[PDB]
Design a protein around this nucleic acid. Structure first.
Lengths: 219, 219
RNA sequence: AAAUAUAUAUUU
RNA sequence: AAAUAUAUAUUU
RNA sequence: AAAUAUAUAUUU
RNA sequence: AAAUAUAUAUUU
């Protein structure tokens, strides 16, 4: 079977083939054995794998900084960047409707569940096999701070949550001393204020937001 | 210290007695260093410990059915049910305030993140210890449920979730004397059906419900 | 046996 | 709530 | 049983 | 927010 082309990239050789196929095969292809179950488990799994790696390498080890940074790590957006190293989609077995941005990301979770279950439920073995493939990528996504949405959206949701209030944006500067074009706005919430410059009134408001995000992690 | 008593309950003696204490230290007690990042880890950890147990020990391994169970099995109220079996309350230490309901759950998450790490990050181990205790409980919190809904109710949520529609009950006949009669009702959904007998129509429907439930989990 | 009251069961 | 069945107290 | 209320589930 | 159904309660 062409399975071997995946085991090679994965770095593991299944002892129970149907298992591997199951995590790959979609319901539309066979409603009798699809990745619904494995996907469910894989979520909890992969999550742990990542949160663990994160908690262990996060610059600012604080839940106020982790929560948002984890969003991108356990998101289907990232799952594909990780799944692409496997070209998982090629091995998928879907029928009704071509591959979907989230269907693969859902297959990515099913897979690791399949490896986990095939190893005798050896968490340690599996977790390792997982770091051997993406630990580096995750560490990178963490060294940069990759967020799931623009800072402005994040900030808003944060404030509306904590204070049922949206942030305030005020323009402070539209020019420099020698008449150049640079915008300066003060993102503000409650009594917490920050500054942000940008080539645009918007780019300046996304900066000031990013700042008002840190200035709140520890409240 | 006094932790030796907790370690006696857990069945695990820390190498770094500080961890156990860091997990048991609430912000108020010592914002210097408390159970906050450690709980964040155990959050994902404990999540995986159960979702794993759930999947392999659930009557129905369908996402529609697992989702709601795993929802309670990880609630900040089910943890107190677990943690109290170790008096985690008398062991935690907070300065200003009192043991809140959902705070026992935040320290609980951090309690195993402590075992895990001190254990040398042995998920397999940190997982087996967890089962050594909270297995029977989790194994039961799946059958009854948070509210212990009655059979007819359970079936209805099942059918509505999977097919967006409710089942059909209908009386078939009565048996025995005129004072001590017995009813026979048929539970039916789409193309499935079971028969229930009872001293009362509902008693009978109920039984038929818990029979159509099994026949539905064996789909 | 009937009735009032109440409890239990079923029914509406 | 009503009915029917039984039980207990009560009246006849 | 009807109405009402509470909860839960699904739908708009 | 509403509709419908299930469970219980309450009033009748």
């Amino acid at each position: 079977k062409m399975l071997e082309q995946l085991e090679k990239k994965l770095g593991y050789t299944f002892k129970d083939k149907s298992l591997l196929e199951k995590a790959l095969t979609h319901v539309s292809y066979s409603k009798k054995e699809h990745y619904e179950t494995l996907e469910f488990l894989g979520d909890a799994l992969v999550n742990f794998f990542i949160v663990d790696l994160l908690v262990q390498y996060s610059p600012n080890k604080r839940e106020g900084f982790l929560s948002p940074l984890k969003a991108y790590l356990i998101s289907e957006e990232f799952f594909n960047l990780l799944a692409q190293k496997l070209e998982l989609h090629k091995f998928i077995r879907i029928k009704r409707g071509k591959i979907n941005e989230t269907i693969i990301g859902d297959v990515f979770e099913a897979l690791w569940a399949a490896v986990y279950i095939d190893s005798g439920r050896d968490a340690n073995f599996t977790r390792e096999l997982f770091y051997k493939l993406f630990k580096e990528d995750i560490l990178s996504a963490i060294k940069e701070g990759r967020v799931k949405k623009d800072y402005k959206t994040i900030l808003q949701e944060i404030t509306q949550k904590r204070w049922k209030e949206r942030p305030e944006y005020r323009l402070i500067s539209v020019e420099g001393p020698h008449h150049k074009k640079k915008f300066i706005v003060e993102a503000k919430i409650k009594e917490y204020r920050t500054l942000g410059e940008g080539k645009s009134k918007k780019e300046a408001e996304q900066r000031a937001a990013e700042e008002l995000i840190k200035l709140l992690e520890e409240s």
